[PDB]
């Protein structure tokens, strides 16, 4: 599609495999913001956006957070906190015509810069001056849309390019776009190393009836510490407790006197670790 009418495809309920995307060599630009491409497999996302459009060759750099330009300001705007990846490849074999492909349009003039992630479809005549247009093009009446002159004889920097950008959003919702990872059996009441939809960490998964949690998944504390989590396979409220901490204090007389010690682990009920309490 065109720049001002960029498509957006909803992606959900996926075993998403990005390895085939990474191993393909048909993409000239392969840049990701905030996520390592090799690490896309294990991560889980609640929803994925795929926006596709076609722009000029010199404008591939403009698709980035905090970038300024005609298309950047008036056609497509990225949030400053954008996370995801950007994919672009040349399309002379498909989107170039010797007479000039006139099916691609982009906006020239508009009242003010548009907010990030919003679409403009109105094709009203821009008022460049004071003379009322009244639907009639003329002086002080410029059509905001211009058609790209894409031809196979044109320069490399001007060649048409197809752009597909992937944006990943994360929030407190049941993630539905996961990667090809096998879920193992649950083991509780032991110090384990769990992974609940990308929630990494160690601890013991005791079974606790914390509350109903009719629609909630996570439980938090004063710090950014997930206390209770809801299982993704079944529906139960597990409770995370970190492993045992403490300190090793050494009780010793002077090494001049003798060579003996006595170890003390404080704040440790060492029924599990001449034993005293």
């Amino acid at each position, epitope marked *: 599609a065109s720049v001002y009418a960029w498509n957006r495809k909803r992606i959900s309920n996926c075993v998403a495999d990005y390895s085939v995307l990474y191993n393909s060599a048909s993409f000239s630009t392969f840049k990701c913001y905030g996520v390592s491409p090799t690490k896309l497999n294990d991560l889980c996302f609640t929803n994925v956006y795929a926006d596709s459009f076609v722009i000029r060759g010199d404008e591939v750099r403009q698709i980035a957070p905090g970038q300024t330009g005609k298309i950047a300001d008036y056609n497509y705007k990225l949030p400053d906190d954008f996370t995801g990846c950007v994919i672009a490849w040349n399309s002379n*074999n498909l989107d*170039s*015509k*010797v*007479g000039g492909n006139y099916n691609y349009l982009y906006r020239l003039f508009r009242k003010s810069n548009l907010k990030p992630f919003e679409r403009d479809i109105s094709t009203e005549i821009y008022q460049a001056g004071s003379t009322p247009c009244n639907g009639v093009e003329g002086f002080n009446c410029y059509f905001p849309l211009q058609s790209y002159g894409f031809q196979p*004889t044109n320069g490399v920097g001007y060649q048409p390019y197809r752009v597909v950008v992937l944006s990943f959003e994360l929030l407190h919702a049941p993630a539905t776009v996961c990667g090809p990872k096998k879920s193992t059996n649950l083991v509780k009441n032991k110090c384990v190393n769990f992974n609940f939809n990308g929630l990494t960490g160690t601890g013991v998964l005791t079974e606790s009836n914390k509350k109903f949690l009719p629609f909630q998944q996570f439980g938090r504390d004063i710090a950014d510490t997930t206390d209770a989590v809801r299982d993704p396979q079944t529906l139960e409220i597990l409770d995370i407790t970190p492993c045992s901490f403490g300190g090793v204090s050494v009780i010793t007389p002077g090494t001049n006197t003798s060579n003996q010690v006595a170890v003390l682990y404080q704040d440790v009920n060492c029924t599990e670790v001449n034993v005293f309490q």
Partner: antibody
Amino acid sequence: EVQLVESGGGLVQPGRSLRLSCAASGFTFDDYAMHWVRQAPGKGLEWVSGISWNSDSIDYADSVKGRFTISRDNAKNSLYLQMNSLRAEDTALYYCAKDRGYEILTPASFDYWGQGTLVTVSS
Amino acid sequence: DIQMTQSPSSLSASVGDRVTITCRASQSISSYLNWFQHKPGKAPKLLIYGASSLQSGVPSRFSGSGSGTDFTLTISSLQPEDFATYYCQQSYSTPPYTFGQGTKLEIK
């Protein structure tokens, strides 16, 4: 896996018209360009005509201008080629090729072809 | 108008040989060349679209190269199913889809 079968080959006199068809079944016919190719009995390939994914842009070869009218029917996956005022040099073999893109004049080549239908212009 | 030329006329090799078919374009076409294998008994097929891009569905034995006004096609083995005529087609100049002449390949 795509199939391209033509029809309309026969024997006609010079200056007489005959009508071609070509059936496509192995792909989606509504979003590709189609071309007609001519193979002389004792020469090489030659391009004749092409139509876009929709009936918008149509181009003809220089030697066949004003004589051929390539049509299209997206409903039943079938294109046509009406040849008028045939001469003796048009007794070649005609193929029904498919374009990789959606336009006529693009750097995209012809990916899939079909067995031709031989025509003769003689008495 | 653009003229498209074929250097070889007829070649002969063996089942374990290696030959190269070259095609020269009068004017620069910027790596926009295509190669077709036209078996005389049935419909022609496509081997390499673009300068050196190999279409899915044919063995990776074939390999193309060249840009500008010089191009070349090579076959590494010439297996007993490779006897056919090969054409080079340009898709960059105003005359649409100019084909080069044939190049018969009979292994003996």
